[PDB]
Amino acid sequence: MNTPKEEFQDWPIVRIAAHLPDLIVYGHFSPERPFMDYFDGVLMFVDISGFTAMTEKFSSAMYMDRGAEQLVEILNYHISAIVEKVLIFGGDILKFAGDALLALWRVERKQLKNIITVVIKCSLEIHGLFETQEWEEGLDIRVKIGLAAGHISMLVFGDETHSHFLVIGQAVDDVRLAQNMAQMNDVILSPNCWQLCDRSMIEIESVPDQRAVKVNFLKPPPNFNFDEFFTKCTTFMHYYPSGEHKNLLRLACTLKPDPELEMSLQKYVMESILKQIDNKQLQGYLSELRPVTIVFVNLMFEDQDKAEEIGPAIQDAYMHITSVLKIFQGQINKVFMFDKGCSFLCVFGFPGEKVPDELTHALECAMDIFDFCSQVHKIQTVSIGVASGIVFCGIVGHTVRHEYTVIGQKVNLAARMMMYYPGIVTCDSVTYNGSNLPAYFFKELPKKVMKGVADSGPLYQYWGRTEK
């Protein structure tokens, strides 16, 4: 009998799993919300703000109304190269959030030392991709890398139709702190990463006023062979593609239909992505330069990285947020930690989600969220930034690992406003002027220089309907 080759496997379940890390795809978690798990690992934070900063040049008339298509193409070309490096070195891309790619090597505590070596090599090879790189004006197609190691907590929250996950804890805080110290082309190690690493592998430089360190070179001992070392490390990598499947970038490329698993996984993916996955919408429909309102919600906790107390509080906040956004087809695009606060990136006006009077609705939704979350047990401070304008939306990443992402000056502005004007609902001039709500519902704010934004325009506090 003939032996014809297996079909290229591109079942819906495989297409869904492209949008999710192995942490979720193979997690088999309890249905309970919140769900908390605890493990150890090495985190890599790749700052791709240098790539995402391209949204401005692609809004130019030079791109002839194909700005979004051109942007997604060049962003994915460069980001795919980073993704392939992380996956080949055995990492799990957790999230494309906060103009960064966050990757995880989950390993038993005893193996952290050897895995840091693998992750440092990976980090240097990432930098090596962009060594002879430019874009005919600026050479700043480069990245910054922060690494951390240690205890990691995972939170899964949501309801019966939607699920979100977050990683929590000191190593999560550390990796963001480490990447923030990095200059372009740097690999910075968190204090605990430096303490846990194989110091015989690396030459470091002190970081002024910091216990974090900078990797100058990976200079291994004489009898060292990275390939044999890597092979030894794969013993501890549960999902590294191997044997029959060593030619695939992810084990998840081999996932077979399984309705109970697909029911679980689809809850992490928004419905317009699932429409595309089901071949019920054109594959290019979600790549667009679209006017939206960003409502960026930051929740601060006293117990800044203790999953047992912050997990219920986030789930409580989520249940209210989701109820508020449902009314106006608002979506939660991303949730992630920033300086130990939990941030919800909410978007009004996604494709096919429109709704007229988007601005006044966005403000009223923000105030509703503000008032409710301020009374949630263990939430110390709520801050909300509201900014409106043209943003890039689209699926960013590699074919085998990508996520729907919103990028733009107005996303960064709403994020910076919630940090620089804590404890209040703030909005930009577009939102203030467009809302047509009476002027005394707002307070014109002092101008703050916010790192990443120049120049914000007049900013306002949404005070609300009454003097209160």
**Closer CB to Cl ion, 342 or 418, in the complex:** 342
Stretch that binds Cl ion, among 167-175, 290-298, 423-431, 446-454 (CB under 5 A): 167-175
Task: Tally Cβ neighbours within 10 Å of residue 278.
Answer: 11
Closest approach of Cl ion to the CB of residue 259, in Å:
27
**Closer CB to Cl ion, 18 or 167, in the complex:** 167
Q: Which residue from 101, 166, 345, 414 is in contact with Cl ion, where contact means CB under 5 A?
A: 166
Closest approach of Cl ion to the CB of residue 362, in Å:
25
Task: Map residues 211-250 to x or -, x wherever contact with Cl ion holds by CB under 5 A.
Answer: ----------------------------------------
Closest approach of Cl ion to the CB of residue 200, in Å:
32
Whole-angstrom distance, CA of residue 334 vs CA of residue 404: 9
Whole-angstrom distance, CA of residue 434 vs CA of residue 255: 47
Closest approach of Cl ion to the CB of residue 338, in Å:
10
Which of 350, 341, 342 minimizes the C-alpha distance to 290?
A: 350
**Closer CB to Cl ion, 343 or 388, in the complex:** 343
Q: Which residues are annotated as a binding site for Mg(2+)?
A: 47-48, 99
Q: Provide the CB-side half-sphere exposure for 29 (13 A, CA).
A: 24
Greatest distance between any 2 Cα atoms in the chain: 83
Closest approach of Cl ion to the CB of residue 102, in Å:
6
Q: Which residues are annotated as a binding site for ATP?
A: 47-52, 99, 144, 406, 412-416
State the DSSP H helix or E strand holding residue 38, giving kind and residue range, or none if neither.
strand 35-47
167 is a site residue for Cl ion (CB under 5 A): yes
Whole-angstrom distance, CA of residue 197 vs CA of residue 396: 32
Closest approach of Cl ion to the CB of residue 95, in Å:
5
**Closer CB to Cl ion, 68 or 94, in the complex:** 94
The site that binds Cl ion (CB under 5 A) totals a number of residues, namely 4
Closest approach of Cl ion to the CB of residue 204, in Å:
27
Q: Measure CA 55 to chain center.
A: 17
Whole-angstrom distance, CA of residue 134 vs CA of residue 142: 9
Whole-angstrom distance, CA of residue 408 vs CA of residue 55: 6
Whole-angstrom distance, CA of residue 366 vs CA of residue 387: 11
**Closer CB to Cl ion, 202 or 342, in the complex:** 342
Q: Which residues are annotated as a binding site for hydrogencarbonate?
A: 95, 167, 176, 337
Whole-angstrom distance, CA of residue 421 vs CA of residue 387: 13
Ramachandran region, residue 334 (left: φ > 0; alpha: ψ -120 to 50; beta: rest): beta
Closest approach of Cl ion to the CB of residue 335, in Å:
7
Q: Measure CA 67 to chain center.
A: 23
**Closer CB to Cl ion, 142 or 401, in the complex:** 401
**Closer CB to Cl ion, 167 or 269, in the complex:** 167
Whole-angstrom distance, CA of residue 431 vs CA of residue 437: 10
Which of 279, 239, 258 minimizes the C-alpha distance to 14?
A: 258
**Closer CB to Cl ion, 63 or 338, in the complex:** 338
Whole-angstrom distance, CA of residue 414 vs CA of residue 251: 37
Q: Which residues are annotated as a binding site?
A: 47-52, 95, 99, 144, 167, 176, 337, 406, 412-416
Task: Map residues 312-351 to x or -, x wherever contact with Cl ion holds by CB under 5 A.
Answer: ------------------------x---------------
Given a contact cutoff of 8 angstroms between Cβ atoms, the answer to whether 81 and 101 are in contact is no
Closest approach of Cl ion to the CB of residue 176, in Å:
10
Whole-angstrom distance, CA of residue 240 vs CA of residue 220: 24
Task: Map residues 94-133 to x or -, x wherever contact with Cl ion holds by CB under 5 A.
Answer: -x--------------------------------------
**Closer CB to Cl ion, 230 or 336, in the complex:** 336
CA pseudo-torsion sign 28, 329, 300, 172: positive
Stretch that binds Cl ion, among 80-88, 159-167, 197-205, 452-460 (CB under 5 A): 159-167
* Sites for Cl ion among residues 62-91 (CB under 5 A): none
CA dihedral 29, 30, 33, 37 (to 10 degrees): -50
List of residues contacting Cl ion (CB under 5 A): 95, 166-167, 336
